[PDB]
Nucleic acid binder design. Structure first.
Ligand SMILES: Cc1cn([C@H]2C[C@H](O)[C@@H](COP(=O)(O)NP(=O)(O)OP(=O)(O)O)O2)c(=O)[nH]c1=O
Ligand SMILES: [Mg+2]
Ligand SMILES: [Mg+2]
Length: 342
DNA sequence: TCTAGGGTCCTAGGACCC
DNA sequence: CTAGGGTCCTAGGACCC
């Protein structure tokens, strides 16, 4: 049938929390991320900072050259987790059909809801208002028949706005809809499509499905389908973690193995008490290490393993260091597990 | 500018299992 | 009358947050 899906997205999440807890900011360029000292990257920035072009995933050195007066914050994660849990409770007030995508995002299947006369608009509006009141955080929302259009509409009226796409508005909306606006379509994909003369969903509607399946596989099918406005993806609410890892980037050096091992020794206690939280007996289908080199190239080494143990990680990391390092310096060391199925 | 720390899913080359 | 099909490892890419 036709569903009423709602995507909720917190506006400038981290920076919003930090500004909420410190009004001395608010009107100044702030950003959450690591220092150029410790080779950091911007997690997110507030709007005054974005005015200078400060983006997420931007190297802090690049952001400081764009915004010399950028105030750099480290990040208060628990303060984000409380907000996330809170807004999720707020979501649960309206339905059980809830698929959290992160801390500040969630899909809601709100069709069978009898809350605001079956209106997803008033429901989303009330969720945003409730969030505003109970958290002093602002939020934006997308309302759509399917998921990806709810996600797209979620960004069309931010900050503190919501956008609604009706089944009757879908075809007109799809025609001049750039493929890069579709979730799952990043720079590489969009450049591939662009090179193939495809920019919009309307461009894809007049395309051969067989060709798309050839050049992209599943991605081609999904591209064609959502270009048609088809997204049979159902809001899950039973979704679970499929991995946990602990990795770190240094100022650098480490060209010696003892340094890598020391860093592993300092990384393992945390891989423990993060895994212990969601399986006290330390489950594990696979275990592994990751190394990132000075050329920014990285390698991972995992293996079938029955239970978390430091020694094996150290051995594997020794083999990765011995065989794949190639005399290169290492900027990052990482540990990783994979968990089991139910 | 000099590029985090988390995760998701997808593919694929080769190794097994039958 | 040497096994191809399918599943599993496992390393890596693209992507999102
Ligand atoms: C994209 C991104 C986000 N984050 C964190 C910071 C954000 O506060 C949080 C939510 O990400 P988002 O919704 O994609 N970004 P935002 O909410 O801060 O920006 P917007 O207001 O939604 O436009 O995730 C990163 O730590 N690295 C990233 O690359
Ligand atoms: Mg978002
Ligand atoms: Mg957000």
């Amino acid at each position: 049938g036709s569903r009423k899906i709602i995507h909720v997205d917190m506006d400038c999440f981290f920076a919003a929390v930090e500004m909420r807890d410190n009004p001395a900011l608010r009107d100044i360029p702030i950003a959450i991320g690591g220092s150029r000292e410790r080779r950091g990257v911007i997690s997110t920035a507030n709007y005054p900072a974005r005015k200078f072009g400060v983006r997420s995933a931007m190297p802090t050195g690049m952001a400081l050259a764009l915004c010399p007066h950028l105030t750099l914050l480290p990040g208060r994660f628990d303060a984000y987790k409380e907000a996330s849990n809170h807004i999720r409770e707020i979501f649960s007030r309206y339905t059980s059909r809830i698929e959290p995508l992160s801390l500040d995002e969630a899909y809601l299947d709100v069709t069978d809801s009898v809350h605001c006369h079956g209106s997803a608009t008033l429901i989303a509006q009330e969720i945003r208002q409730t969030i505003f009141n109970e958290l002093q955080l602002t939020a934006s929302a997308g309302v759509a028949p399917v998921k990806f259009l709810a996600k797209i509409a979620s960004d069309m009226n931010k900050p503190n706005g919501q956008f609604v796409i009706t089944p009757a508005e879908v075809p007109a909306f799809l025609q001049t809809l750039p493929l890069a606006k579709i979730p799952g379509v990043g720079k590489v994909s969009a450049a591939k499509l662009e090179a193939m003369g495809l920019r919009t969903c309307g461009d894809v509607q007049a395309c051969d499905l067989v060709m798309l399946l050839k050049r992209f596989g599943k991605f081609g099918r999904i591209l064609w389908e959502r270009s048609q406005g088809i997204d049979e993806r159902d809001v899950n609410s039973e979704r679970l973690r499929k991995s946990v890892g602990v990795e770190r980037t240094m100022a650098e050096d480490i060209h010696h193995w003892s340094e890598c091992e020391a860093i592993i020794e300092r990384l393992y206690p945390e891989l423990e008490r993060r895994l212990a939280k969601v399986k006290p007996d330390l489950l594990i289908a696979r275990q592994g290490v990751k190394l990132k080199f000075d050329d920014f190239q990285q390698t991972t080494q995992e293996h079938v393993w029955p239970r978390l143990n430091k020694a094996d990680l150290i051995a594997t990391a020794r083999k990765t260091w011995d065989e794949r390092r190639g005399g290169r310096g290492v900027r990052l060391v990482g540990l990783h597990v994979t968990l089991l199925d139910p």
